[PDB]
Amino acid sequence: AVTLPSHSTRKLQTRSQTWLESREYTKHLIRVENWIFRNPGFALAAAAIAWLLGSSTSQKVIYLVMILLIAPAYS
Amino acid sequence: AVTLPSHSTRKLQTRSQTWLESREYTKHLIRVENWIFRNPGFALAAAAIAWLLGSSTSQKVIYLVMILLIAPAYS
Amino acid sequence: SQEGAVHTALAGALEAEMDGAKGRLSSGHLKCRLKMDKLRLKGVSYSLC
Amino acid sequence: SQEGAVHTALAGALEAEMDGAKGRLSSGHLKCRLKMDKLRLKGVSYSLC
């Protein structure tokens, strides 16, 4: 169906390479980058929302990054 | 291939139902619930990480929710 | 065969159907102005039943 | 047909092959202690060539 949980959660560890190893790093980066490239307005909105939340600078930056990661996945 | 961007980003809005409308709701909720149910200890890890971050209680709860959201998607 | 991931990648996309070189969409939205100034009544100057 | 979604859903799952009713895995992990006390040296008491 639609969900189909990923097996990388329970990755089997051994010397030999797993099923689809070479695509793990690129996969997530490409998804996030493509979504952000299509929608910059949400980058602005997330910057604003992160600025409103969190006292210190580091808290606001972390909020910005976590929003920018949650948005593409609709997690 | 692996990425395959979702079309719900550009959801075509009209009176008639879209291609797979009845599933979205349970789609995301089921993915998150399943991943958490399989890996319970990460709830404790996220609680600790959220407690270490953010001054007020609301900030810490929001950090907890956003971590528990972003982890199952590996976003 | 990838044909099940594309079906789930499609979400919020409108279905259609096709007859020959023509394709019927069944969900749209059109805006019209109705010039109703040459409309009459076909029932005035009638005797009551 | 869903067969491409499962291929992507599989990640970090090991590849295996099968001969008849038996399945050969080529990635594993075995622990063996080597009792090396009945090994001798064949060359002892040989005049050097």
UniProtKB/TrEMBL annotation, chains A, B:
Q: Which domain of life is it from?
A: Viruses
User: Where does this polypeptide localize?
Assistant: Host cytoplasm, Host perinuclear region; Host endoplasmic reticulum membrane; Host nucleus; Secreted
Q: How does it assemble?
A: May interact with host ANKLE2; the interaction may cause defects in brain development, such as microcephaly. May interact with host SRPRA and SEC61G.
Summarize the protein's role: Plays a role in the inhibition of host RLR-induced interferon-beta activation by targeting TANK-binding kinase 1/TBK1. In addition, recruits the host deubiquitinase USP8 to cleave 'Lys-11'-linked polyubiquitin chains from caspase-1/CASP1 thus inhibiting its proteasomal degradation. In turn, stabilized CASP1 promotes cleavage of cGAS, which inhibits its ability to recognize mitochondrial DNA release and initiate type I interferon signaling. Required cofactor for the serine protease function of NS3.
**Protein name in UniProt:** Genome polyprotein
Q: Which organism is it from?
A: Zika virus
Covered range of the whole protein: 216 to 290 of 3423
UniProtKB/TrEMBL annotation, chains C, D:
Please specify the portion of the entire protein covered by the chain, as first and last position out of its full length. 550 to 598 of 3423
- The protein here is known as Genome polyprotein
Q: What does this protein do?
A: Plays a role in the inhibition of host RLR-induced interferon-beta activation by targeting TANK-binding kinase 1/TBK1. In addition, recruits the host deubiquitinase USP8 to cleave 'Lys-11'-linked polyubiquitin chains from caspase-1/CASP1 thus inhibiting its proteasomal degradation. In turn, stabilized CASP1 promotes cleavage of cGAS, which inhibits its ability to recognize mitochondrial DNA release and initiate type I interferon signaling. Functions as a signal peptide for NS4B and is required for the interferon antagonism activity of the latter.
The record's note on quaternary structure and interaction partners says: Interacts with the structural protein prM/E complex, and the NS2B/NS3 protease complex.
Please give the coiled-coil regions recorded for this protein. Answer: none
Q: Where in the cell is it found?
A: Host cytoplasm, Host perinuclear region; Host endoplasmic reticulum membrane; Host nucleus; Secreted
